[PDB]
Symmetry: C2
Subunit: 563 residues, 2 copies
């Protein structure tokens, strides 16, 4: 019993449909071709199905109008790369490239992607009837930059006909194209500013796209690697996919640097790399995990603190607005053609989203600092429990020491009668008495639980309020986006900059209190080490002095055997 539900779309000579089982969640797309076909087209569809048996919603999101997040673009490169190489191994050229061919499928947080409009049709497909797999490189890299910037790499916002008439008139050794308001065709051989990708990836992706967006058909793939039978863009993509890039969120200056690393980097070698590269001393390189764990350098988002500097100044915002957006900050009432307005507003929304991520990640590392504080706390609890244990045990040892030497003093005083006693033993036991004489236990305990209660007081956010502010702004961008003055948006910029400044300065006060707690702990540690060491040493001396007293008793047994 298959339920004839709503369609999944329009496909073939009919509709792509959703046929779920009536009881279970068993969905499949069935490409309806019930319409009477010619036998070349019917049989054509037959071997189409036979060979088949052998994302566009994400392309139109409000939150990535200037393009997608880095890691998501990476996963699209590896997944759609495996699909495209999977089709080229199967001696199959798809040629029907579009974001609608790609399935969304959550597997535990991971979206999986397989392959199932004149902007994707190749210019040699605009001209000639036969084709090669180069159209997959042109349309695919085209769609890749449609993930990178959110829109078309060549002359976007035009109709595709005159668009390809300028593609075949474009210098193919360039990357990005745009058109100004004065009618100038200005095109760039480099990627634009609105990007989230690290430059270490960008420039091999730049020249990679110089091979990809080369509209000359014979040079779309690469100078072919004759050792692995492989075009150059595949080699560059597998090169990029195995880049080991870490990220150290430079907290004290509100920065982050990506680090392209060799695969044999020990963490100590990376400590030297940061000490020479960033100039931050390894005696103060405080490196916390996403869970706030300090590393082991014996192993091969990282959070960067200065162990020395407790003073935390203001954040160092190295991201400005573009001068279009700052022009609208200065003058919001100018009613331009609304395409450039949604461009400017989009840049503003991506900026304020950057601010949201700033409070997000700084907030995150603040929490990780608190978790490391908890780990130091548990260390302190262990050390103080062992400390007062051995302390009080040592006190009882002193107790039976004093009673024992009191009894020994009695027996010595009685055997004094016959002149048996030797005074060097007595003065030795007096020395043992002064050593038995030999508070800050409980006082430094009060330092411990005082700091403990202080931390718990520090335990007692506003970027959700700024999420309502930015959320209002992106709602403005949506309600102005579906349409065929910007003052209030600049006011949201005001409230987000100033509110962000307030809560960042308060959290910097929190962090200063945290490092004060941490330095107080690290000051408390060798107190516990020296104190515990004196406890164990003094213990073992008193125990050996009891054994030495038993050697004196033993010597009295020698005196008993002497007579």
């Amino acid at each position: 019993p298959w339920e004839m539900r709503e369609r999944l779309g329009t496909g073939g000579f009919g509709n792509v449909c959703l046929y779920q089982h009536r009881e279970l969640d068993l969905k499949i797309a069935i490409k309806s071709c019930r319409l009477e076909l010619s036998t070349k087209n019917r049989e054509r569809w037959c071997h189409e199905i036979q060979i088949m048996k052998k994302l566009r919603k994400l392309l139109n999101k409000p939150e990535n109008c200037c393009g997608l997040k880095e890691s998501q673009i990476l996963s699209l490169l590896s997944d759609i790369g495996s699909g495209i190489r999977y089709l080229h191994e199967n001696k199959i050229i798809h040629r029907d490239l579009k974001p609608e061919n790609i399935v969304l499928q959550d597997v535990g947080g991971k979206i999986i992607h397989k392959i199932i409009t004149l902007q994707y049709l190749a210019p040699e497909l605009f001209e000639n009837k036969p084709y090669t797999a180069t159209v997959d490189y042109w349309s695919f890299g085209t769609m890749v930059f449609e993930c990178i910037a959110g829109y078309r790499p060549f002359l976007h916002h035009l109709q595709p006909f005159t668009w390809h008439e300028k593609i075949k008139k474009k210098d193919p050794k360039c990357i990005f194209a745009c058109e100004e308001m004065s009618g100038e065709v200005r095109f760039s051989s480099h990627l634009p500013q609105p990007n989230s990708l690290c430059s270490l990836i960008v420039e091999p992706m730049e020249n990679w796209l110089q091979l990809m967006l080369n509209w000359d058909p014979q040079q779309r793939g690469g100078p072919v690697d004759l050792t692995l039978k492989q075009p150059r863009c595949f080699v560059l993509m597998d090169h990029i996919l195995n880049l080991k890039i870490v990220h150290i969120l430079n907290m004290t200056s509100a920065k982050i640097i990506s680090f392209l690393l060799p695969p044999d980097e020990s963490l100590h070698s990376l400590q030297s790399r940061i000490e020479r590269e960033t100039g931050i001393n390894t005696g103060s390189q405080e490196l916390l995990s996403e869970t706030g764990i300090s590393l082991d350098p014996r192993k091969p988002m990282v959070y960067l603190f200065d162990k020395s500097k407790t003073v935390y100044e203001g954040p160092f915002a190295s991201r400005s607005l573009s001068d279009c957006v700052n022009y609208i900050v200065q003058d919001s009432k100018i009613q331009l053609p609304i395409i450039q307005l949604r461009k400017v507003w989009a840049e503003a929304v991506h900026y304020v989203s950057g601010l949201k991520e700033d409070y997000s990640r700084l907030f995150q590392g603040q929490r990780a600092a608190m978790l490391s504080l908890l780990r130091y706390n548990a260390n302190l609890t262990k050390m103080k429990n062992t400390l007062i244990s051995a302390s009080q045990q040592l006190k009882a040892k002193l107790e039976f020491f004093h009673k024992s030497i009191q009894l020994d003093l009695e027996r010595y005083s009685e055997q004094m009668t016959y002149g048996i006693s030797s005074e060097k033993m007595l003065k030795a036991w007096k020395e043992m008495e002064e050593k038995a004489i030999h508070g800050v236990i409980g006082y430094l305990e009060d330092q411990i639980m005082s700091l403990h209660a202080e931390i718990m007081e520090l335990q007692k956010r506003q970027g959700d309020l700024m999420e309502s502010l930015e959320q209002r702004a992106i709602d403005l961008y949506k309600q102005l986006k579906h349409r065929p003055d910007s003052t209030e948006m600049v006011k949201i910029i005001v409230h987000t900059v100033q509110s962000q400044d307030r809560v960042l300065k308060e959290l910097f006060g929190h962090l200063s209190k945290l490092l004060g707690c941490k330095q107080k702990i690290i000051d408390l540690l060798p107190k516990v080490e020296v104190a515990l060491s004196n406890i164990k040493e003094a213990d073992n001396t008193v125990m050996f002095m009891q054994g030495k007293r038993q050697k004196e008793i033993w010597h009295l047994l020698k005196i008993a055997c002497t007579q």
Copy 2:
């Protein structure tokens, strides 16, 4: 510089006025008599001022329409009693009695009261020109029942003329008067039901008012006590003022009983009084203070728990509605004359206020139970700290016991050579070894901190929501009160009864968890006593066994002196 502010009222031949200093809070009432008086009236006012140099807002509150709280009436009796006797000692009859003569003055929570409308003018003042101090007794006791019920003791809601025409036609040996809807004059020699005063006070206040509201002028004060020159009502009022009445809020049945007590009652004698009177066993008489302290019976709102019974059934509401109010619960749309409606609605508001006080005081004793739980907790913490202290000290004593007897075993084994050793000492030291052999320490510790964390979980109110419901109801009574259907009020009765039932049953679950915690603690206590006792005893045995070993060493010194 005195500021001529607004008046304080109208008085004399002008206005009672507020003349504050312009800088300080120095207020005084000045009785303006600027109007041209005759010299008997001007000089009359002169000796009035000369003798003077030698509350009505509270009478009209929305919350006490059926009369005032008990303790406040008590304080008015002692304060206005001291004022009236203060005036009768000064050979002065005021005769101008009204609630406007009484000053409100907060002193740390206490209102102080001193003395400065035809319903207060006496019937002999309605008839004759000369008078005595009996008019103070009539008008004063009149105003007293105007505190007790909130309105006039004789035929209220009438005009004062025909009112006194029925006062002089009333049987003066009765107390309360009313008039029915059919024109019947029905008057009562007892106090009505809408009262908060305890009956132990009510009936001497009943007969006290039978002397007070006796409109026969010669019998208003009393059969005069010839030993203290004192009318009977003064003797009865000082008798009532020195009554020592405590209150035990019977929590398990949702009750409270006042207890008139002799002044020499020990708390153990009162435990017998509760065990025979209430039938609640002194082995289960759990008596907690307002701070939740269990008493010392060696000393002379009390909270009553059953130590045995952990099952807490539903509350036992012995306060019903009157059948007028229940009639309006059954039929709310009857538009009566609105005087009886505000009477019925007023009874409803006082009922729901009683419910508010029920949740208030049960909530209060619940909190006191939690405070007593905290006291037991601190006791447990002390006992466990001392316990693990003496435990681990005992462990170190066993340690040097075993090393000591190991060394003694060595010396004994070496002096075995010459046949010096005596095997009874050896077998004795083996017995000492098994005694040295002679977990639930830390296990019952886990019981302790397990229960501690469980209590802290129980630590994590709705009568404020019912305060909004009742507050809505008294707002209905005010908005219908200022006017010259009751269904929604009965719906508030529904929500307050059912919501009150829900939160009371939840809090009864809380209390069951509390007594479970308490019985768990009291089970944990003799474990600590027996365990600690075994620790101290076993300690003192091992220490004496070391001293006995020193007596054996002493005996070896006797063996050394033997040769």
